[PDB]
Amino acid sequence: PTKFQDKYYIPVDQYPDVNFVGLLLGPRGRTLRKLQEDSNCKIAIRGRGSVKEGKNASDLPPGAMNFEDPLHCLIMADSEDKMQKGIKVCQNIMIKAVTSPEGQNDLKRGQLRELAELNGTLREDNR
RNA sequence: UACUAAC
Ligand SMILES: [Cl-]
């Protein structure tokens, strides 16, 4: 969008051992691309901790190597309404990560299942 | 709940 942009800060200090980035991206980044279609926004994960140590920097989009800010979703839209819907769907995911009772995060279960399909390691047993 | 890495 580029006309309207906002940063949604991820509560890393409060939850230092929750993997928010993985829950947002999903297998192959597919969850984040769905969130973008949901909100009609471009969404990027940026800031300190948004890049695995240490990725092929020369293969990264502009601005991705700026770690001055804490971890955030950068939301970009071409109306204020869309931008706010983008903040909403990111906040939804953050809330899901923190308030899901152990083992009841359906989004994450589905993600890990789909990941296993892609890696050919799917199992459907109780062990 | 197979631990995700998009642009
Ligand atoms: Cl079996």
Side-chain angles (χ1 to χ4, degrees), chain A residues 1 4-51 54-55 57 60-103 105-123 125-127:
Chain A
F4 296 90
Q5 102 164 22
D6 202 17
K7 300 177 184 165
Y8 174 73
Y9 291 106
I10 296 175
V12 175
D13 293 356
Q14 295 90 343
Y15 291 95
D17 306 300
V18 169
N19 181 8
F20 296 102
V21 174
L23 186 67
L24 285 160
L25 289 172
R28 293 185 173 181
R30 290 174 183 182
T31 299
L32 188 69
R33 287 193 292 268
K34 285 180 185 311
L35 292 181
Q36 285 165 107
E37 299 166 36
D38 293 343
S39 54
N40 250 253
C41 284
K42 181 175 199 291
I43 303 172
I45 305 178
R46 294 290 183 264
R48 192 191 326 124
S50 62
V51 166
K55 227 242 181 185
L60 282 170
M65 285 295 294
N66 183 359
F67 301 135
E68 263 300 293
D69 291 326
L71 187 67
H72 59 279
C73 301
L74 174 64
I75 297 138
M76 303 156 273
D78 44 49
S79 80
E80 187 119 59
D81 265 17
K82 286 174 179 180
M83 187 201 65
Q84 279 162 24
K85 193 182 188 180
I87 296 163
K88 176 172 183 172
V89 299
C90 288
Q91 202 153 215
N92 286 347
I93 301 302
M94 252 43 81
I95 291 172
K96 188 163 290 169
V98 158
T99 67
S100 281
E102 184 75 318
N105 187 338
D106 288 341
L107 173 62
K108 187 172 175 160
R109 195 170 54 251
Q111 287 176 335
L112 267 46
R113 191 167 119 90
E114 175 178 22
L115 193 71
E117 287 277 42
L118 294 165
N119 292 327
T121 59
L122 184 73
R123 34 162 173 78
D125 49 84
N126 281 324
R127 307 173 249 98

